[PDB]
């Protein structure tokens, strides 16, 4: 059903606004097309490590994401590469929150301080075959809103 197309509308709306610069927009449009096919070819866990590494989530970017879960005027700081990968990381976590695949409280306290990030990635790894089955239509919807609402470079 199309619940995941509505979910992809809320998520893309948050990202489309937290990305202030228009060159950061055109970078997320690049991520949305490439990172959906890489989860197809390479799988979820390889692509997630790739995403989460180019995101460069220190703690400053973690608060922007954690706030963006709740507020609608948070803004991603960084350059086109970092913000776009950090935006796409939020795109993914937004799905695992709004689908009960991860407890939102856990995911937020995991993103916060020091080391439960390793617990998250460890947990995300055990749910890998479940996630890569459920997000296909969602990430494919994100890929099409991106190509529609964001002009090319």
């Amino acid at each position: 059903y199309e619940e995941d197309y509505k979910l992809a509308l809320e998520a893309f709306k948050k990202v489309f606004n937290a990305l202030t610069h228009y060159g950061a927009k055109q970078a997320f449009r690049s991520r949305a097309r490439d990172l959906v096919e890489e989860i197809y070819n390479s799988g979820f866990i390889p692509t997630f490590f790739y995403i989460i590494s180019k995101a460069e989530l220190n703690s400053d970017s973690l608060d922007s994401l954690i706030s963006l879960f709740s507020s609608d005027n948070a803004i991603l700081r960084g350059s086109d590469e970092n913000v776009s990968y950090s935006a796409y990381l939020f795109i993914i976590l937004y799905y695992l929150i709004k689908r009960g695949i991860i407890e939102q409280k856990f995911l937020i306290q995991a993103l916060r301080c020091e080391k439960t990030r390793l617990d998250l990635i460890d947990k995300l790894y055990n749910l890998a075959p479940i996630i890569s089955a459920k997000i296909r239509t969602y990430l494919l919807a994100i890929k099409r809103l991106s190509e529609a609402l964001i002009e090319a470079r």
Partner: protein, 285 residues
Amino acid sequence: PYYAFAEPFFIHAITHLHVGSGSSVEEEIDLPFQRDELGYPTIYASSLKGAIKSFLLKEFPDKRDVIYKVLGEDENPEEASLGTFLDAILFAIPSRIIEIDSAKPYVWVYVTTYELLKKVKLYLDSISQLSNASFSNLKNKIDTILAKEGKNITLDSDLKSAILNEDFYVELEALNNKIPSIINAGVPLLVLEDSIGREVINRSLIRVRRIRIDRDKKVVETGGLWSEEYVPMKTIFFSVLLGKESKESAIFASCILRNLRYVILGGKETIGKGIVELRWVKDVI
């Protein structure tokens, strides 16, 4: 018998193969491969028939009337064709292997699953009734394999373990005694459970992004970047060519089907895709 001749065969990809299923909303690859009813790659018999029929019409330019009877006219079809093709079932796909727990090293290996074999048993059980032709040598190999269901087995090997397509660990149990190499080659054949085989086979497909470059300024065009999906060279599909008796089905089976060695399936022909080899079961033993 319902069918005069029943000629099962194997389709060996000489190069990479691409029979297109056309773009679609829910695909995420722009030009995907023709899929099965349970996910695996396949060649629709409409692709087989049209490709083989077009091949024969130019290789045997004097047997037009013999081909037109068995494969149907093209201008004014006043009747039905006498020959049928069956959808090519994926028999075995080449997989990359890490030969752990052994010292006899293979670089790749043939991988098939049990659900893929059950569809080959079905094709053999059916056409062994709609025709007098029996395929006991093939039907008994397959049934010997199907007895060992619920376990990953290797036919002509001693492996005990492997890591297929860089990710998938398998604990193989060699077959009871041996099976004489259904697809004759030094490379072994693994029969996997379908939970693992689904992932292994999907990881073994070839997905390629291509671009189009502007003709004057050497730069990619606008949105001229698409992806495609090929089936690896050395893949094997199983199909059957059935025919009803007409005095042309006899010639077709006796003159045309013995000079059919290499045809060209699918599309992307200028990329060298689609060259393929037909290996008839009647002479594969």
